[model samples]
Target: TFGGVYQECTELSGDVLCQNLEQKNLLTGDFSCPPGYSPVHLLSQTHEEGYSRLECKKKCTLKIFCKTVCEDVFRVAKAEFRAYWCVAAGQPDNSGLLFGGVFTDKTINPMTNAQSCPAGYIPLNLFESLKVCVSLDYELGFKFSVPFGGFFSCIMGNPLVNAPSLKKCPGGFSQHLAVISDGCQVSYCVKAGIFT
Candidate 1:
């Protein structure tokens, strides 16, 4: 019942997305996607994460467009993060950090630390890890099932960061959060009194 069922920018909620994940034959034992509607690859899963290949395959079903490998599905499930967020919200772009939740949203701090807290909000053990990089490598070639080309393209891109691969960067490029508030120059898009 969320208005932005598949819109972009709007943060994806696990509560709603889980419904789709649970319905997957990979978990609940059902197989079917409507005509023209393909299945999403269940990337970021794991045996330890509690999903099996049979479940993933069945979940993908004949109607699906793609099913992610166990590892990728596991990653998606961890923070209710979408594959796209890794590419955009992740480091080396906006703030070089993966953001989520409300305030803290996981970012690096002044001393080069990766931490996960809602932005504008602080967690208790805030000093433990100041910066945390995105996880990389999702099991082998990372191929499972393909229901749509988008699924293949999105997951195959490997959004996770490999700090070591950055090369020559001291220690590593820490992740951090950067707040943006200036909008006077941009076109104001308002509909129903809400700027999208």
Candidate 2:
């Protein structure tokens, strides 16, 4: 078995892959919704030039609680995406919930801020922070499962926006690779000097 199995990043990626229609823009904004309606999920579709944004509104229109479709123009890479999030009438309020988007570990251009590691732990490459953000969101509400690999795959969600820094790696553990799964990015820690 390897010594260190977890990874962490102090930064996030901001590289533009392509100009496809279904691609998502790096820039995110506050979506407008009708009164008594709240945002449930973020939907998008790709095209040659850019993409389109569809805000799934819940509890705003249909009396039985149906998804009110709202479309707007957006940008994305070359990819196809489609979904229907409607459920039974008056199910529960998932409005404050945000979903969609895949998480990855591949390196990209223009990374985010640097992260500080406690003693005995070393800092690795700085990738996009989105994985960290989505992980937290998924765990808190989405019920998404982030896979863990033995002692090496233990992960944590970096706080949203200007994350201060990761605390120490418990007692005798060190930082390992960060994996993007389910809906979040997890950084595992292993015993010290195991692989180092």
Candidate 3:
């Protein structure tokens, strides 16, 4: 043990590979995701440089969808760290799917919540906002943020609000908002563009 922090793997059970992958340079002990989900990419929100095994373990416990393992354990530079990945398990390519709002612990039923959207554009108003679901059905919730911004989570039935009318565009990209039509419903979209 490395100062009561590191633990050696003594056994390997079924479907649990405790060996290191030479190509990937990763040592997985008990890494597995729940059914209907697959680990796609790194969960960069909680990642840090030069992290400890204990700290990574604690981060995994904070979120149900989160899991961590040692990365680059035997680097040429001799630097090891802990990292996590985002599991893309909840989302299925089904009908009438939309993503928005904050990511939180509240789980949504993909089968039940997948409502049908209508055709044609609808006017967006502050009082009547459109509902947006971040994931197909988040069992453990979600984490959201803009670039270099704080993280935010969501609850059930998150809505998209109205945008401000500006005389001049803030940046090089001009402000553009539209209410797009989906199957049986409508959703709003904003983009940065230049106008004539």
lDDT of 3 by residue, 15-116 (tens): 222232111211122333334433322111111124233323324564686766644342111212121222223443332112232111232312233232
What is the lDDT of every predicted structure here? 0.22, 0.29, 0.22
Residue 190, model 2: lDDT of 39
Off by over 4 Å in 2: 1-104, 107-166, 177-186
Highest TM-score, which number?
Answer: 2
Q: What residue runs in model 3 are displaced by over 4 Å at the alpha carbon?
A: 1-29, 43-77, 90-196
User: At residue 84, what lDDT does model 2 achieve?
Assistant: 14
lDDT of 2 by residue, 1-196 (tens): 1111112111112324222112121112212222333222222223222546766645555577676566565754443332111111233233322222222345321112233222222222212222322222434433432222222111322211123323234455555545443343344433456442
* Candidate 1 residue 95 C-alpha distance from true site, Å: 11
| Candidate 1 lDDT over residue span 1-196, tens digit each | 0000021111243323333222211111234332223333213321112333332332355766556654334233222322111122212221211112111234343222344433322222111112211211223211211111111121222122232122111122222223211211101011121111
Best candidate, lDDT-wise? 2
As for lDDT, the candidate ahead, 2 or 3, is: 2
Each candidate structure's TM-score, on Cα atoms with residue i matched to residue i, is: 0.17, 0.20, 0.16
